[model samples]
Target: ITFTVMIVGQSGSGRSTFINTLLREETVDDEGVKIQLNIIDTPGFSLDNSPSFEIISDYIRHQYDEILLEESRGRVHCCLYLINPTGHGLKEIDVEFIRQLGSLVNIIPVISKSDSLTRDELKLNKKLIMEDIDRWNLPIYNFPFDEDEISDEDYETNMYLRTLLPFAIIGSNEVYEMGISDFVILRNALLISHLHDLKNYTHEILYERYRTEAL
Candidate 1:
């Protein structure tokens, strides 16, 4: 399977480093074949430029258009929206971009360079970020659940993962071993845990909606 992911954030949000980390931590399937992954890292848009938002929105929509025409081609499965951990909360552009493209893609908000914040500050930042997202009515990827459909264990697992939204990520290219970190956890979720769900949502729901409204 081909998994395509996009990373969107400001220039200094460690987008490049995060890509490098994932490229190195490639996962192998049961057949001992490497799963192919394609990453599209958008140019970090500055907050002041109004046109930047338009361009980003167009770029994302373009991907949808292409996929709508060609089923064999790889469409974007997930988008990692990086947030600067030091900032007070989501910026104007941040809210605009997500609001415009949120429904078009699976937007997973990530706090970049999370080590910059203290535990309490990080907690507060996460709270504030989620609040801003709510205020703006941004459709970020929330791990969905059906309690009656799933077992208790699966329900608990999905609920626990939901609390960790807008995930705090620390990207490093020089980690000696594959130890546990938010980055690692994200990698696993993207490629392993929720891989099928992401693709299914993109193909079945998102693409279908686009096709309906577009055609």
Candidate 2:
């Protein structure tokens, strides 16, 4: 089976540039490891004075279904959340965006740009990241991008994304594949119950609560 992965984060979070670097690292060995990548590199959220952030939201929603891996009837087993290590944590926009995306499929939050912060910050940030996931009850991780970790000439691009290859395998529900590997699955289908319900739950608490109280 195949897996569809999407990288998302706030504006200036370095997601677009990260994609370029990922493709480069994935292809550097030229081993014909073709992991189809779909990118929606818009600002994480609209500026305070910009047009409606709904535009960005709408665009992401429109492209969500299109981002899946259609070939080989692959299921989108994992999602890579591109977070800015040096930046602040979740806001309403991010929480909203992930809420919608989670409705579509299983997601894994990824902390991007490990090199941007000092080694100390990385540890603290990672701890806080785990706290967020545990608090939110979401499946997420701290993906450190290291080109040097590429073991094979034709592996799954960066060493971090490669970690997700195990989710599709047996007895790997919580395990990670940090190397270039393959995964097998039953089929490619998103259950409305698992994903959609998650969206609803997050939407009400994250958006509505913040809207009513923050403003």
Candidate 3:
């Protein structure tokens, strides 16, 4: 299956490195599923300018043209928004970008270069980001699940994963037999548990929203 994931942040957020880590531009087999991960990135054009937002929107919506003509399933299925690990609260652009784009995409914010910050700073960073999200009421992907529909262990797992918001991801050029990290869990959740949900949102819910406004 073709699963497209887009990465959006600033140039220095180690966005490229994260992609390189998440994908070696190769196919991955998870359990019995063969996933051909289609990766997207926002390179060169930074979001400092207001007009850039619309351009990004165009790029996102334009993906739908194929489906409109024929259709990430026509748009990006999931967007991984990276936040700087400087430990400062969300920037004006950060809030604006995330809030503005929240309606258009399922965003999962990650702390770039999480190792740069001390453990205390990491906690603070996650706290501030979550507070800002709540303050703005940004509709990020919350790993939606129906308790009655899912088993107890699954619900608890998704619930705990939600608390790890603005997930702290560390990437390195290290030992070959490297152990696990947050990235592992993240990749697991997205590729395993939440994969279908993201695609469904793109094909069913989000497109209806776009159609409501666009058409």
Candidate 4:
């Protein structure tokens, strides 16, 4: 299927970096396929920036002009709604974004910048964000902005998070599940090269530290 994946988020929310990691573009091989991925690094939304919003919105809408004229050339498989975990979890504005996009495309809430928050903080932050599971009732990805924790050993964490990635892929296979977009799941994946590679906490290093940190 012709799929266009759009990663939407506020400015400085690590949207570009996340896309790079998702496509595995930073790695040694080319994982990105023929998908038309328009990484929408949108400007920060403000009442004063009316034209920017209109321009972005108009451009995006025009992509679907075929749908208006007759039928859509392709369908938006999923939208990765990236949120920087550096701020308070899911504010009023976020809810509005979720509500607005949730109906239009398959939305996946990704908590970007995971490395910034301590493991404990990530846990608590994820708890607060999970409230949407009941309200939005869709799949969610607790993606941490982990551009710094990339490494061969960190694959365990990435594996843990991969559990959530499949659901989004599955949800996109259908047309009716479009409105019921977004899913929230705990993912501790780290980005290699693009993000830190938990050097301070390597297997032996982290185990030793874990023992000492307990005291």
Q: Which structure among the candidates has the greatest TM-score?
A: 3
Off by over 4 Å in 4: 23-41, 44-61, 71-74, 133-215
Tell me which residue pairs clash in candidate 2: 10-44, 11-44, 26-157, 103-195, 163-177
TM-score of each: 0.81, 0.45, 0.82, 0.50
- Candidate 2 vs candidate 3: which has greater TM-score? 3
Models ranked on lDDT? 1, 3, 4, 2
For candidate 3, write residues 90-123 as lDDT tens digits.
8777888877787778888877777666667777
Tens digit of per-residue lDDT, candidate 2, span 1-215: 12234444555556566556432113111133333333333444343734434554454344443333232172233345655554445545446556655544345566655545564665566566555655665533223223464245424433433333212122322222322343323221222222333344334332333345424
Report lDDT per candidate: 0.71, 0.42, 0.70, 0.45
Candidate 3 TM-score to native: 0.82
Using TM-score as the measure, what is the rank order of every candidate, best first?
A: 3, 1, 4, 2
Residue pairs in clash, model 3: 66-71, 67-71
Relative to the true structure, candidate 4 reaches a TM of: 0.50
What is the lDDT, from 0 to 100, of the residue 45 in candidate 2? 36
In model 1, where is the ten-residue run with the lowest total lDDT? Answer: 173-182
Task: Tell me how many clashing residue pairs each candidate has.
Answer: 0, 5, 2, 22
User: Where is model 2 poorest over a 10-residue stretch in terms of lDDT?
Assistant: 22-31
lDDT of each residue in 54-90, candidate 4, tens digit only: 5444544454444444522443334566666645556
